[PDB]
Amino acid sequence: GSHMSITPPQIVSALRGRGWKASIVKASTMSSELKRVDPQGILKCVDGRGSDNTQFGGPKMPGGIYAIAHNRGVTTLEGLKDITREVASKGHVPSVHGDHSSDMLGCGFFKLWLTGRFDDMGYPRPEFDADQGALAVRAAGGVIEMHHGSHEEKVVYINLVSGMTLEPNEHDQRFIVDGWAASKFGLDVVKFLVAAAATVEMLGGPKKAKIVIP
């Protein structure tokens, strides 16, 4: 695994520098919401909407496993299938998602990536569309989740408590980012968090973060 190079207060500084409101929350203040990761839960998107998911307890990352491919600059279906099997072998059921309004283009993160909204940040675009990616993930043993409703995220939780995660609540929505999980998969963490913040910004999400720590 890789590790975080940056500290929580720096993350906060980084966010405030981007015009965000950000603070540090102690895991003890969330003893109730913080759930231990269940290896049977899908590693899914930070999306705060409800969905047909029945495999809870998995870590949250932008676009599900797309976050891993995005961070590493993996842009092929085969590479995506590699990542799908890698995730499955590291204690999590891999997945990507779409919704009922825009089908596979229902994942804000991937749409941003596919449409080049990450060009300015120097990210290689994927070499496949949302439909190809989803089917490729499925064929490699991954899950295709489907959301519904509208985005009503009120806050962004950047959880740094390893082995723990936060779940969606469609009636009181929030974006959830398990930063500790980027470390587990050897991603450039700073680079991952910045990508997550930019994702929320470009989707017009709430620029308010709560950084959860042990």
Resolution of the coordinates in A? 2.3
CA distance 83 to 214: 29
Pinpoint the alpha helices (H) of 18-153. 66-72, 77-89, 108-114, 130-139
> Other C-beta atoms within 10 Å of 169: how many?
13
149, 36, 47, 137: which is closest to 93 by C-alpha? 137
| Region class of 47: left (phi > 0), else alpha (psi between -120 and 50), else beta | beta
Query: In the chain, what are the domain boundaries?
Result: 1-214
Find the radius of gyration of the CA atoms of the chain: 16
* 154: CB partners within 8 A, 6+ apart: 172, 173, 174, 206, 208
Experimental method for this entry? X-ray
Residue 100 marked as a ligand binder: no
CA distance 142 to 76: 16
